[PDB]
Enzyme design. Structure first.
Site, PDB file in Angstrom:
ATOM      1  N   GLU D  70      49.944   0.781   9.823  1.00 52.67           N
ATOM      2  CA  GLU D  70      48.724  -0.040   9.720  1.00 52.67           C
ATOM      3  C   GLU D  70      48.233  -0.247   8.279  1.00 52.67           C
ATOM      4  O   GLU D  70      47.771  -1.341   7.923  1.00 52.67           O
ATOM      5  CB  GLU D  70      47.601   0.532  10.613  1.00 52.67           C
ATOM      6  CG  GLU D  70      47.821   0.342  12.131  1.00 52.67           C
ATOM      7  CD  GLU D  70      48.834   1.281  12.729  1.00 52.67           C
ATOM      8  OE1 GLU D  70      49.217   2.324  12.102  1.00 52.67           O
ATOM      9  OE2 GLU D  70      49.237   1.014  13.891  1.00 52.67           O
ATOM     10  N   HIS D 140      41.817   4.619  22.933  1.00 56.32           N
ATOM     11  CA  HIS D 140      42.018   3.259  23.462  1.00 56.32           C
ATOM     12  C   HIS D 140      40.672   2.628  23.815  1.00 56.32           C
ATOM     13  O   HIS D 140      40.613   1.606  24.549  1.00 56.32           O
ATOM     14  CB  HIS D 140      42.906   3.299  24.730  1.00 56.32           C
ATOM     15  CG  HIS D 140      44.361   3.307  24.468  1.00 56.32           C
ATOM     16  ND1 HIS D 140      45.276   2.981  25.455  1.00 56.32           N
ATOM     17  CD2 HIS D 140      45.078   3.594  23.359  1.00 56.32           C
ATOM     18  CE1 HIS D 140      46.495   3.053  24.936  1.00 56.32           C
ATOM     19  NE2 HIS D 140      46.398   3.483  23.688  1.00 56.32           N
TER      20      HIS D 140
END
Ligand code: TPP
Ligand code: TPP
Ligand code: CL
Ligand code: CL
Ligand code: CL
Ligand code: CL
Ligand code: CL
Ligand code: CL
Ligand code: K
Ligand code: K
Ligand code: K
Ligand code: K
Ligand code: MN
Ligand code: MN
Lengths: 336, 371, 371, 336
Positions: D70, D140
């Site tokens: 990322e 999540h």
């Protein structure tokens, strides 16, 4: 210079803030054989001298340099702490803590919770230079505490003086939770004060009322405490206004009760910090005080903060929430 | 003769770029062929029959548990699941080469390490269901296993974060003078993360007794390795960090075992990291290959195979049924362990919830939760 | 024959760890010896006299500027300074091998690239003083140079952040069908950052025309390379990423030039990254070596040396004096360029400041700032 | 399910939120030949289907997978944008944005300022799934907007519906500043609504009053807008209370004027968000509204937020600031 620094535990000696850090670290390694200190350039004493002498005294296996990699420094420190050993990591400037943000927020802060307390990294402390320094510009000036304040599971602690630094740093190192300890670097070589040679603790999550007052409550932390102390003096001399001056000390978890009790008394609050206004920690304090003290508030809560820009080089004297900015906001609030 | 502190080398008087050797990569170590025959007697581990049978039964029990929990997830009975298919040999073979107290860090494909270490079926199930028996207190998604007793650090979802942590733990072990290793499992995708570079480099400069165990199955979700890296896998990175490295056939439990055992021996003795890259398939299967080995020694047969298939299905189904009919933990556990202690402002939120439920409780699933 | 998508390799039937080769590292490419003689005629670049003199004069002008600004920092006239001593050859030699429009990313040791590209002394000084002439508007500390006209991306303090950015720029150049390269400079310390692993790997998988130029001077602040890495410097990492790599003598402008020129030629043609690791000293100096070369060709002498020493000191001192007596920019520039436009709430802060200064202005250095 | 989704630009068709993202992205690539889309697993259509078909239509050089990294994805995107090309990066879950925090906060946000506008990365947009999903637990589920709200130089934008998503995402992609666009993933496959096929824009830094009211102002964003809409209905039916319901849409820079104008009218404010209370963006809104509307406030401003914990798995129904929690806080505020 934009501030003036001024002012039971056994023998003391005069120490500046960097020396008081070294003394904390020295006491820690002496009494805790598991404790190690590591980071960039810590072995020779550190770029701000905070680790001078420690490697010679405690050994190269306990005071050591890492590769130049902040995400690694924090991850490595977590791992030490997972084994129960005390890990005192250094991040060279708070401005460079961001590469480790994922390791701090997603890992360190959540380690205990997500394992049901099967594992933890409570013996981790991350220390880093913080705050403006007159010419540090974008990457030698930052005050990142508000970024960390939105993360349950870490503690964020900021001292105002050498005596406060040693007692708060010892408390972070011994606290059973991952702590970030931000050292105001403009104070490292500023004025000394008497600091106990032997270890002592100052409690976390406790603000300190350093001056009692009845007309207005002023809250800050770090160097900005010295600014608000001077503001209190200006308000007394020029306006006949009595100011209650509070050092927050711990950003999270913060001492809500001490702040609310003061504002219930005074009915007015001004919070100041060098960090940008928007999303700054003053918003959390103001929101909360408004919720708990709504009926006691005589005037809108004031926030006197850095502007919503990056921290500039040549414009620093115009950027900071100095005594004149704080004073003027205080003046208007009193006249409300 | 060059006088540069950054490197040890001669001069060269002609311009030559160093090329990667990707077509002729690091070779893949294998001990037994696909019919389960030892290829090179000098490489036989001569593991005793009872240990090899424990390898087989751990792998097959895992595979049975996967079938049942995969189906449970498809039905929405649990919210998430990651299988171990193709990874049974890498995990049991490596776990068998560790000392029981060596600390394991990993992520999603490491349940076999726990199974080898005798983690109860009841606790695998308790975590996946988030029930009252879960020592994780139902807080993490499924397959986020951990066990303090069996030295298996609780899994977390962010990939590769465990890599530099594992190195820190190994550094601490060194200092404690432990005769202990740390092993750190991760996939080939995760190896792309910055935290992998951090971990590999720290382990080498700080001389840590750690085994990096990279599972290379050719894919990270939909991404083939051609889009993940361009050198010769992950094994070829090790030497650039000063890390002793090897590549092994992940379908061969004995190759995995041998590499892990030797890596462990040298890591602990020399305080230096080792990198093992085990090549597997995304799912010539580790269970079948070991089965052929067993038959060749006279250590197993069809009757035993059938009976164990039945017994393992019954053991998994008993644990499964028990796990489904347990309640979830007290909602109060949503607030503990955020810090060691509970801050007063957090206790205030907990009290807010209790007051809210006194009034509005009929709108919440209170009957499914303990107390 | 192995059938694994993660790597291309044979089987091996014996357990062998691959060792790093650190004692016999990648050799150091050199073109001229310490007396300035070409060692191998086939490696002579035969740069024309006027270009070689521009190399020499750029390096010496830089060195003159460093002496003066270093002293200015010691006196507190500027707040920060980073010298280029020992790096004059790596920067001018590489810059001379680039096309003028190739985009440069770097950090603190790259002023020579700007000097080669004729960046005015006035603008180096304007940035260091934060004066009204600074196109950076006085916002960054000193030596945080940038120039859009000369395709030199503004320096920032966080190490290694420019590495994956440089790769993105190179990817865009590829798509635009540019005949353009990107070069990205960083030190050996910075190469430890996770962003270096990101950049190297992305450049290879995404097939980008970029030159990674690593300066290895054996130290990162107080940290020797023995505490920074344990493989054979940074050049040895390149092959593990599938990157063509070379090591060069950073005290030899011609070795640097030759490597950079060939790297540029191949990167742009093949859309593939190249890694050059130039070995230097932390400060047998690049300026002296080139001087000996000049004398050997009959291209310079003591009279020219003396005269240029005097002329360069005068040019730097004129720029220096002018820079010190310019005002700083309008304080209003503290608020612009945060976003492209100025949000209304930001304009409100700007107005707050203007009101504050109307009343409290005598307590601020208003006379030093424009308007 | 804890919410209910309900409800001039040419031809429309029914689209769910993922489809509306794909339509935005498709329009963008069609009209801007420089534009590229990249990240983890985007080539085959993405893990939430947001890029289905785009690589086949626009080419492998414009819709492509990166390595699993990322910090690299964001750094790479900045670099594309430095050249003036439109870079649409994907971060697979907002929970995994933190590795890129340094690239976002120290680089992207400061790129224009620190160069005096010689360089910028204005053509960068980072999109990422966000918010709770019923069972996502710690990694999540997260809502990270408050972390980014303390960083001058980026914009943070969050839609409530498919129509809003497409118009706001197009505006982010075309805006001349680095934008983070958070897509509420619980909505990706929830109910469809009519969405224009052709490109259109919804302005950034503008809240939307979706229902006028005179007794109380309710502010939220993302999925939580649907919760507060339902709260408004409950308050009308059960209490005879008229609620003004506002979707903030842009977190920074935020629409201070729209919120203050509403509160001047109603005299009461309740702000709700799934993110933890402490340091959450509700504190900035509450602080600011208190500063601008002090004399109009009839009751303390209420914040109904997630608790100060990590986002739990099995306890999610007890964690979220649901309609009953919002309603009860509204009830007490009205009775103040
Ligand atoms: C930091 C982060 N980014 C993305 C994800 C989403 N993710 C879950 S698994 C996976 C692929 C991992 O591949 P690899 O490491 O090769 O392991 P494998 O699944 O092949 O066993 C991804 C991208 C994540 N969990 N963490
Ligand atoms: C992310 C980050 N961490 C730390 C620093 C402080 N720092 C400034 S220069 C430097 C050493 C860099 O060494 P190297 O990359 O080898 O370059 P050299 O100074 O030797 O030319 C450090 C640690 C920084 N600027 N950024
Ligand atoms: Cl089944
Ligand atoms: Cl995941
Ligand atoms: Cl209901
Ligand atoms: Cl001088
Ligand atoms: Cl620096
Ligand atoms: Cl004064
Ligand atoms: K601690
Ligand atoms: K992990
Ligand atoms: K940089
Ligand atoms: K944009
Ligand atoms: Mn994989
Ligand atoms: Mn260096």
């Amino acid at each position: 210079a934009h501030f003036t620094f001024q002012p039971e535990y056994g023998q003391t000696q005069k120490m500046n803030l960097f020396q008081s850090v070294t003394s904390a670290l020295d006491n820690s390694l002496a009494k805790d054989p598991t404790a190690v200190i590591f980071g960039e350039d810590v072995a020779f004493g550190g770029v701000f001298r905070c680790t001078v002498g420690l490697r010679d005294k405690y050994g190269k296996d306990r005071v050591f340099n890492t590769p130049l990699c902040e995400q690694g420094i924090v991850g490595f420190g977590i791992g030490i702490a997972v084994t129960g050993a005390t890990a005192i990591a250094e991040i060279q400037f708070a401005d460079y803590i961001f590469p480790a943000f994922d390791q701090i927020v997603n890992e360190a802060a959540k380690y205990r919770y997500r394992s049901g307390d099967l594992f933890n990294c409570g013996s981790l402390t991350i220390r880093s230079p913080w705050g403006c320094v007159g010419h540090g510009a974008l990457y030698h000036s930052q005050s990142p505490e508000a970024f960390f304040a939105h993360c349950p599971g870490i503690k964020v602690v900021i001292p105002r003086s050498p005596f406060q630094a040693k007692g708060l740093l010892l408390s972070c190192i011994e606290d059973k939770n991952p702590c970030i300890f931000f050292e105001p670097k403009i104070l490292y070589r500023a004025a000394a004060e008497e600091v106990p040679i032997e270890p002592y603790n100052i409690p976390l999550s406790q603000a300190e009322v350093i001056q009692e007052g009845s007309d207005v409550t002023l809250v800050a932390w770090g160097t900005q405490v010295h600014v608000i102390r001077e503001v209190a003096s200006m308000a007394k001399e020029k306006l006949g206004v009595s100011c209650e001056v509070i050092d927050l000390r711990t950003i999270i978890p913060w001492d809500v009760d001490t702040i609310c009790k003061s504002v219930i008394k005074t009915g007015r609050l001004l919070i100041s910090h060098e960090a940008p206004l928007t999303g700054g920690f003053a918003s959390e304090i103001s929101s909360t005080v408004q919720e708990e003290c709504f009926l006691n508030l005589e005037a809108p809560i004031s926030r006197v903060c850095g502007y919503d820009t990056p921290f500039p080089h040549i414009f620093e004297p115009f950027y900071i929430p100095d005594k004149w900015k704080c004073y003027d906001a205080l003046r208007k609030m009193i006249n409300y | 003769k060059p006088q540069f502190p950054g490197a040890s080398a001669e001069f060269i008087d002609k311009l030559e770029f160093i090329q990667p050797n990707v077509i002729s990569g690091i070779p893949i170590y294998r001990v037994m062929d696909r019919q389960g025959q030892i290829i090179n007697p000098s490489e036989d581990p001569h593991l005793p029959k009872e240990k090899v049978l424990k390898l087989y039964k751990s792998m097959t029990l895992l595979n049975t548990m996967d079938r049942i929990l995969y189906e449970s997830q498809r039905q929405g009975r649990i919210s998430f699941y990651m299988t171990n298919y193709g990874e049974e040999g890498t995990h049991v073979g490596s776990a068998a080469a560790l000392d029981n107290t060596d600390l394991v860090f990993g992520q999603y494909r490491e349940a076999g390490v726990l199974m080898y270490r005798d983690y109860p079926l009841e606790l695998f199930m308790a975590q996946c269901y988030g029930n009252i028996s879960d020592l994780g207190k139902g807080r993490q998604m499924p397959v986020h296993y951990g066990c303090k007793e069996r030295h298996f650090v609780t899994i977390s979802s962010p990939l590769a974060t465990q890599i530099p942590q594992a190195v820190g733990a190994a550094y601490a072990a060194k200092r404690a003078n432990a005769n202990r290793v740390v092993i750190c499992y991760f996939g080939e995708g995760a190896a792309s993360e910055g935290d992998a570079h951090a971990g590999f480099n720290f382990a080498a400069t700080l001389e840590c007794p750690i085994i990096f165990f990279c599972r290379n199955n050719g894919y990270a979700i939909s991404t083939p390795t051609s889009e993940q890296y361009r050198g010769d896998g992950i094994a070829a990175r090790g030497p650039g960090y000063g890390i002793m490295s090897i590549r092994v056939d992940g379908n061969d439990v004995f190759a995995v075992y041998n590499a892990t055992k030797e890596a462990r021996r040298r890591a602990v003795a020399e305080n230096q990291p080792f990198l093992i890259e085990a090549m597997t398939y995304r799912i010539d299967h580790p269970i079948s290959r070991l089965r052929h080995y067993l038959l060749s020694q006279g250590w197993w047969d069809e009757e035993q195979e059938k009976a164990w298939r039945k017994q393992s299905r019954r053991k998994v189904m008993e644990a499964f049924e028990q796990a489904e009919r347990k309640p979830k933990p007290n909602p109060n556990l949503l607030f503990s362990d955020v810090y060691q202690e509970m801050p007063a402002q957090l206790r205030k939120q907990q009290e807010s919830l209790a007051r809210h439920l006194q009034t509005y409780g009929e709108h919440y699933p209170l009957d499914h939760f303990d107390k």
